[PDB]
Amino acid sequence: GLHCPSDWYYYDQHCYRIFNEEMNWEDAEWFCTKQAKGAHLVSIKSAKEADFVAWMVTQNIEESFSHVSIGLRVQNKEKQCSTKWSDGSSVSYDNLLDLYITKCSLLKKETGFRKWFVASCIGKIPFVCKFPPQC
């Protein structure tokens, strides 16, 4: 409990914690923000920190959840991000279904929480929070 609140883990220079509560991406990111100054959904900025986050999630996720939101999201305002068609003409009209718009991201139990997967921003899943404690 030295640099992080109770139930948070301390790794390199940040506190982390998986919340086992089901939320969509932006509700999750807003919830993270309310936990502490500078908090956000996790960001994962090297192989060592991917390692630490996967372990932490392995050890604290509730057995019946298997997807965890992380903090990567598409910025583009268009439905999908090809601005050109293969004939060179431009994508100025676009009828891609909401269901297939996958602008958020997640980790999966079935892969040891280790690679990053594109996902619908409207799914309701557990998520990991990250923030830098002060000294």
Binding site: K45, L72, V74, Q80, C81, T83, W85, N95, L97, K130
Partner: protein, 125 residues
Amino acid sequence: GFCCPSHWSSYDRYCYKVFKQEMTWADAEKFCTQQHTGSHLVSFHSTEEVDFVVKMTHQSLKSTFFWIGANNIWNKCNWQWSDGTKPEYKEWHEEFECLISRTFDNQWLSAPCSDTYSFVCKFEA
């Protein structure tokens, strides 16, 4: 205007054709480019034009899904961590998605670029 060759269909000032053989996105596209000068997987710039090409493929196809001409739809994105930073380090599950149309609706969806579908070619008459 100019006329479309035999076995292709006309709408607005373009020529379209259904091909039934099932190919990857990349293969469908390349094959389209060898059917005719100017030819590629179909692209769409109006509802009226999706409806035309959906009628044509419904009347001719047994699968319900076909490639249209946009690839890598999520590789191309500007992705950003919510703490405002750009991912230098990455470990994305590698994935390539490509646009697909349906024959009973105007709406589109996607599929892995590596899968195998019937497709429609298009070019300017």
